[PDB]
Each structure stands twice: as structure tokens, then as C-alpha cells.
Amino acid sequence: KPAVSVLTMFRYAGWLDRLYMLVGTLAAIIHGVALPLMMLIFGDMTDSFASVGQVSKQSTQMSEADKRAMFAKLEEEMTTYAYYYTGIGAGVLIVAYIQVSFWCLAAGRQIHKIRQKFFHAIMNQEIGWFDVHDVGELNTRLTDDVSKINEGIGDKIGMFFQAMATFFGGFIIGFTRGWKLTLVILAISPVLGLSAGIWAKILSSFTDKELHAYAKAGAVAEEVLAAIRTVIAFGGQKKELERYNNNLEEAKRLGIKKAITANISMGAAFLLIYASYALAFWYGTSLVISKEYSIGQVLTVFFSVLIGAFSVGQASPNIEAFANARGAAYEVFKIIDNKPSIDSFSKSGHKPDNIQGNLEFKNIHFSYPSRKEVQILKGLNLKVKSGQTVALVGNSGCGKSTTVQLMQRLYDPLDGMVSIDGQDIRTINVRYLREIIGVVSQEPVLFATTIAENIRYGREDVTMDEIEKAVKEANAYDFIMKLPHQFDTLVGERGAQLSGGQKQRIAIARALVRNPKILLLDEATSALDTESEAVVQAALDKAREGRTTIVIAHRLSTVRNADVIAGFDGGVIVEQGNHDELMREKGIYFKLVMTQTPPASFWRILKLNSTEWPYFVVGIFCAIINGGLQPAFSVIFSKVVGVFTNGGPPETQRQNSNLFSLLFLILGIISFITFFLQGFTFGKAGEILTKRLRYMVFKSMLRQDVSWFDDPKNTTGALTTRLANDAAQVKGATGSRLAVIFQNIANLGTGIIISLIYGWQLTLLLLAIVPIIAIAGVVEMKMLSGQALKDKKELEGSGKIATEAIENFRTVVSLTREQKFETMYAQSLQIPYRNAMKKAHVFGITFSFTQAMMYFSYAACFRFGAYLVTQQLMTFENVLLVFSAIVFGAMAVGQVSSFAPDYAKATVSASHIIRIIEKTPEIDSYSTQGLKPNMLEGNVQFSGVVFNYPTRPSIPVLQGLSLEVKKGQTLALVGSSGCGKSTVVQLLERFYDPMAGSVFLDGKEIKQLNVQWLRAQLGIVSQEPILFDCSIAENIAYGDNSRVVSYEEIVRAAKEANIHQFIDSLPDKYNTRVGDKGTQLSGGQKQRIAIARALVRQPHILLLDEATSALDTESEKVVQEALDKAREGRTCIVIAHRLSTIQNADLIVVIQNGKVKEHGTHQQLLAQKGIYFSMVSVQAGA
């Protein structure tokens, strides 16, 4: 919404840039003008043949006489026009190059200046300006915005003025050569713009509908694939598939409806286009019979106006390009034009010498630009004498840090003054101030360069001698020497990750080269290991003694030797003096002292598609007839112009034009039928395989085992995404592109034969030209992408050192040396700049070549078509025929190159979708194998089990685990911590088989048992029960599948689970919708419902996994009450964390590091002492 004045935007264009734009925009206008002049000549040529065509047929008496005057006229005429054509080709060749080159030259030169100035501005902004602004957004704003500006001031403008020139140029020639047809053409203009208007309305509306449609099906999948371990446990995999099939069923019906309407629209649009196109010509013919116009003129005015009309459509996108560019240039220039109060690039202000380092802070009130929300410094008084060292102490706010912040004049104080020596800090030059102040910070930063270089960021002028003494006086010398490469080592975020205490010591070495008179040390010792702290501490102490120093830390070991200690409370200075005095004050200080002591052949996807043997043949057969249909229009138009051109005695003509204009319209309406057909057939074909695929994919996805689902690569979102993209992407490839590609090959193949058989060697020649300009047209786009990529790589490297410069910024300003970063940036950019010059040279040649080739190619059409071919009997009427036939056959092949990528993107998206079906599990619920025992009663035998999780085969959870629990009794399970407790419940459900060892239920091995039937007997109840959206009765009825449960059954279950209080209370009762689409309710109820699911199944085995985990107060009591009523009739394993409620259990078993450590009844473990007595002691006491 905010934008920029048109003249500001060019502020960096002067002299040449200005001139370049003018010569370019000039050349561009000439270029544009060229094309309608070309079409103007086309009417003159028509007239020349037309005269002879009228006289040739007027003879029917003499022959040899016509071999003279006719040929002579054509000779002088044709040679003239051809000469002019060649004349226009050289023109467009020159102006095209001028056009693109100059405008790109302007672009390059300005953007270079935009770029430099911008970064310079960024580095100049005061720190408060950063504190309010997102650095991330700013740098991404840098690279992305300047590119938009580039797109805006580029050759896009040249293209705009070219388009206007064609628009004006066309309409002028249209109007002058006649007023009538132009206004008749202007009359049909609003109709073609309206139909395209119906398109923007249909597309925008229906695009959301399909997205809205699958959003429903994809909502089924998302709650399922998130809830998977629940559907696997309860084996509802046939149900969730059925639901997904139902939603897919609806989505395809909506899809075919959309396919019907969308094809009707496109078909009707093409009718109106061909209708008006034919209508305009009919009025055109009606004016020729009246002898108002030349038949040749009609072609000139008709082509010129329509060309000039479409020029508006082709112009519009460049307006947008310019428009967007201004908007982008607003926020960039805003920073550039902004001027700071503090500068730091300004040469002004006193530069005192023999600074004695006498500091004072007078009555300073300050607030960081969180501003009025908080005031952290209320007044202040502090003096620090020359050569002394003062230590600041505080509980919170770190208002101490503020003074170190103000002392570098990062911020000017609200009221009061900071005074270095006698003078105010605001009188002295900022750069020099920062230079006479050294700084060492809690978190040290190293830029990526040699250690010599990071030490060279203290001062640009330095020698390895000064480096050496610096690190040595920082006692960083010995430790780095041991490091390989010596001072030439590397450092940064990337590579050479080092001890902090060493980094801090390089930082102290850097600050030391600065040889400052004032030293600020903030917490530098803090947040560091105790051993290396003393090492660095030695350095810090050796860094002072030449300098006055203010230091802040939480280490009171480093304070004692300070000549002055100063505490703050609420921004108010309170205590000052020597340590003993402060201890005698027994104040805040004493308080703190005491406190601290890919492409391949995948046919089979098409084989899957072969379920429709028909519908393809219909669409194909239909499209090939539409292929043969398309050039018929080119054949008519040839003979409409042709017979009228070829007419001879006129009396017959006017009747014929009517017949043609009629037939001209007939291919129009027959096209509606054929286009709607092929589109609808493929469309339905697309939606049905969209079902089969998403079905077979989802289905195969339910098959896989928890091993696959625990994977990091596959998370619920990634699967839904994988599920949508692949199905959609194969559809396009089996879809329209194939319909269209076949339409086109038939289009050209029909066009070629007609052209071939009519012209001998007419056509043969043309076919030599077009593929060459087509390939020449493809290779340009290839170079274009190449240069684009290379430029991206070069500015990526410059933008990288930019990001470095502004991400660490608050440090670089503290050291100054922003000019170093200005210069580094400059040199970085100088390569794309030289690259950007070459770019213009190339863009101009390729463009001009492609245009000149098309214009020169045209000359050959008539030169060889006349002369050598028309000297012979072979005739004009067909020359016009072939012209359209081949050229529009080629323009149709152009769609091949356009639809190339959709195939790849579909094949890659296919490459995944074939594999995802054929991947097979270790454990598949689908196999009907397994024993299906007849005997009810469950035991559970765990013997010598070892388990390591497939995702994390590092720390094993289970090592030699052995448990036994008899039927109809409760096995309590205790543990130090972890899934050791819970993994039991997972293995019995057989989400995994163990590495070694085995587990038995009735004494049979589950490993050889039926996976489905096994789970069918289990009473699983987790921490946070997921309930699908549906009737709460349907959530309960999930406890049993392959059968529908009775109302009185799910009643008995709810009665059992004590959830019935709610369920009679609600308006809907059992049909209430839950899952926080229909309704929301707390955990206590959700759990009780899960309890109902569980004992709806009537399991012989209940598994209660940390059931009361998330819960509170009475809810725990009533849920526990329900769980307790749920067991004692059944085998169960309860891993719950309430050991007060485990006190009644048949067998309690302490698990330790995978091995059962203790086991027994409660009092039995109570009699002993060990882990379990401790477990029960701590929490009952806490």
C-alpha cells in the first residue's frame, strides 16, 4: 500500500543511465512500431496478387500474354516488399539489442548503488533502531527487495513501451486504413474480456471447493494417522479405511462436476472467440463486395487492430512489475534517507588526547525502548576515579549493564549526563569514543576468519608481532600455538568450535590490541567453567593496570581487589566503598555475600489406470478429430481469402463468402462438442484414479507397523502431505497435458500433410526454419536460467557476509570497523556488478537474434513462395494456407515444451507413490494367518526379554525382563522411570517383537500367534485417550469391530465406567458429538469413555497405562474408582504412578534397568527395604 514517487526511485540514475533509458525507450518504441508495419505490407502484397488473381481469371482467352504483365508486376512488387521485409528485420535486430541491453545496463548500475547505499545505511542505524526491529526480516528484506527493484527498472519497462507502441501503432494503422472495421472490432472486444472474466470467477471459487473438499477427507486421515496406535490397538483399520473411502467418494463427485462445468466454460469461450473472429471477417467481406475496401486492406486492418488489442494484455504484467518495484523501494529508501542522532559515521566532535579516564555519571535516568512500560534507572550518581577499577553489584534488572551500555553511548540517557574526563560524552566524536573504550562481554563472538584477522578487527593496521604480544599478554598465546595452522586457524559458527574460555581470551586479546584508556568488562567471567575462569581472570587482571575500569559480574571472587564497590536497588545507587566498609554497612552487598557464601519408466501406474480401457480411447479419438479439426480453420481462412483472392468473375464471389463464413462458424460449434468431450472424459478419468490411488496408498499405510510410524521421517503431517501431493500430481500427467499433447501432435501431423501435398518444397523449406527458431528459442531460456543461477550464487556469498555483519551487529559497532564491512561488501558485490554488465550484452543478443530470425524467416516464406514457386503455376491461395498451417502447428508444439515439467513433477510424485504401496511390514494385521486359540483364560509370560527401540538403538530399555501374571489377578508394575514400565504394554499388544527372548499368553508364543486375535483380547487404556469425532456411542462402540455393538451393551459399559452421569445429562445423550468439533469436555470424562471402550470389548486382559497421569482432585478419585471396579474380574497390568492406589495388588514388581529387581505382594516388599520402600516413602512424605 505504501509507495514511492516516480522520480525518487531513480535517484541513482544520472548521465549515462538517463541517456540509456532514453535511447532504449526510443528503440523500444521503434521496435513496437515495427510489427504493425509488417502487417501493413501484408495487405499490399495481398493486393498485388489480388490484382493478378482477378486479371488471371478474367482471361479465359489468352495464356502467354498473362505470362508477361502478371509476372512483371509480381516481380517488381514482390522484390519491393521482400526488400522492405529484410529492411524491417535488420531494424528489429538493432532496436531489440539496444532495447534490452541499455535498460539492463541501467538496472545493473543502479542496483549496485542501491545495494551499497542500503547496507551502508543499515550499518549506520543507531542501536535503539535495531532494538525495535527484527534483524531477520531486515536482511531477508535486503536481498528480496532489491531484486524486486531490479525486476522493476529492468527491460520490463522497455517491454511496456514496446507494447504501447504496438498498441498505438496498431490502432493508428487500423483507424487510418479504415474507421469502420476498427469500431466493429472494438464492438466485439468487451465480449472476449467478459468470458475470461467468468474464468477468474469460476477458477477462484472452484479452487477453494476442492481444497475445501479434500480438507474433509484429509481431516479423516489426520485424526486417524495421529490416533493410529489407538486404531491399531482396537483394530479399526477396516473402519477408518471405509470412512476415507466415503469421503473420497464425495470428493470425486465434486471433482467430476467441476470437470463438467470447467470444460463447458472453456468450450463456450472458444466458441465466442471463433464466432466473433468469424463475424468480424464476415462484415469484412460485406465491405469488400461493396468495393469499399481492398481485400488486402481488410487483412491489414484486421491483423493490426487485434494485434494492437492484445498488446494491452501483454503490456499489463510489466505495469505490475514497475508498480511492485516502487512499493519495494519505499522501505529500502526509507532506511537510506533516515538519519540518526548518534551517527558513528559522522566526522564531528572532540577527539581528546591524554585522556586521564576520569568518569562520572550524573543524575542519569534511562529506559530502553521498551520505553514507558518500564524505567530501570531512576536517577543515578556515580564517579570512578582515574586508574581505579570499580565493581558494580546487583540482585536484578542488571541496571549495572545499563551503565556499560550508556558509557559507549549506545543510548543517550533520558535525563542526566555521562562524563568521560571533564567533557560530556556527546561532545566527543562517536568513532573515537568507541576507539578509546575497550569492551569484553559475557558471550564472546568470533567472526569467520583467521585468529590474526579477528585480532585484526581490533585495528586494521597491525603486524603479527602486535598480535603475538596481544595474545601473549592475554595468555592466549600458549593455548593457540598448540592449535594447528597457528594464527591462520579458522573460527566462527562453522568450524573450529572451541572452549568458551579460549574464545573469551581471544576477545580479550582483540580488545587489548585496541589499547583503550577505558575498559568495560560485563560478566565476562560469568557463564564459564570454574577452572578456565581463573585462566581468563588472570588475563583480565593483566588487561587492566594501564586503564581505568568499570566491571560487572556475579563473581564476588573478582570484586574484592576492586578499589570501589557499588550496589544498586531499583535503579537507585545505594552503597559505595571498599569491601570491609560494605561488610560493616551490612547492607545489600553483605546480603549477597552471605547468600552466595529421478526419471524412470513407471508404466504400472498407467497399468493401474488401465481399469479404464475405455474413456481414454473416447477422449483420444475425440482429441485427434479435434487435432484434424484445428487446421481446417486454417484451410477455410486460406480459401476465404483464397477464393476471394482467386475469384475472377466477381458475380460468383459474394455467394461463396457466405458459404465459407457459415462453414467457418461450423468448425466453431463442432469444436465445442469435441473439446468438452475430451476434457470431461480425462477429467472423470482423473478423479476415479485419484480415488483408487489415495485409497491404495492410505490402505497400504494402515498396514505398516508402529516401527514405521515412530520414524522421524514420517510424522502425521508429512504423511497427509505425501498423500495429497502424489495423487494430485499423477492426475495432471494422465490428465490434460496428454489430452493436449495428442491434440497437438495430431494438429501438426494433419497440418503438415495438407501443407505438404499442396506445396511441394513450399512446405519442405518452412520445416527447416521453424524447429531452428524453436530450438533457438529454448536454448535462450536455458542460458537465462544459467545466468540467473550463477548470479544467485554470487549475491548469495555477498548476502552471507552481510548476514554475518548485521546478525552480530551490536558487537561490530562496539569495535567500530563498520567501514571494514562496507569495504568487504563492496568487493563482494563487484563480481556480480561485472557479471551484470555481461548479462546485458547477452540478453540483448539472444533476444534480438530470436526476433530477427522470425522476421528474416518470414521473408523466405513469400520470397520462395513467390518467385521460384509462383513463377511456376503453384499458387498464392495455398501459400497462405501453409503459412497458417505450419506456423500454428508449431505454436501448438510450443505447448509440448510448456507441459514438459508437469510430467517430471508427476513422475517424481509417482516415484514415491508406487513404492509406498509395495513396502511391507515385519508385522501385518492383514494376514489371516495365526492360530485363533479356543481357550479363554489369559496368563502372561515375559521371559528373558531384550528390547531396543528401532528409532533409538542406543540406550536399551529392556535387558533380560521376566514377569508372570496369573488370570483374574492384577500385576502392578513400578519403576525408576521410563517406558520400561510402558514397553510391557506395547509388547503384549505386539507393536514390536523383542530382539531376544519371548512372551507367552496362554503359554503360546505371541510371535507365532495371530496379530489381530491377540490384540482382540486386550483392554488397553492410555494416558490421553484420543476420541474420533462422532457419536460418543460410536467412540465406545470402537471397543468392538467386525460387529456392531448393542445400545444396551454400550449402556452396560457406560454404567460400568461411571460416565453415565454426563451421558443422561446432555441434550443429545449418547448421540452427542465429542472431540471438540461438536463438543468439548474435560479429561475425567474422556478417560471414563476410554474405560468404556476397553471393557466394551470384554477383555480378559486390561492394560492401564498411567491412566490418572493428567488429572486432579476428585476426578482422580472417581476415575480410580472406575478403574478399580474394572479390574479384579480380569487379568490386568497396571503401571500407574500412584503407589498409594497400588497398595492393593496381587503382585507388585519393581523394574530396574530392564531387569525385574524386586517383586512381591505389598507387605512383602514393605518388609524388605530397597527401591520400592523408597518409592513409597518419598511420595507419601511429599
From Swiss-Prot:
What is one GO cellular-component annotation here? brush border membrane
Could you tell me where this protein is found in the cell? Cell membrane; Apical cell membrane; Cytoplasm
In this entry, the parts of the chain located on the Extracellular side of the membrane are: 38-83, 176-182, 284-297, 638-661, 759, 863-878
> Per the UniProt entry, what is one GO biological process?
cellular response to nonylphenol
Bilayer-spanning residue ranges: 15-37, 84-104, 154-175, 183-203, 262-283, 298-319, 617-637, 662-682, 738-758, 760-779, 840-862, 879-900
What family does the database annotate? Belongs to the ABC transporter superfamily. ABCB family. Multidrug resistance exporter (TC 3.A.1.201) subfamily.
| Other noteworthy facts | In mouse the MDR gene family includes three or more related but distinct cellular genes.
Name of the molecule in the record: ATP-dependent translocase ABCB1
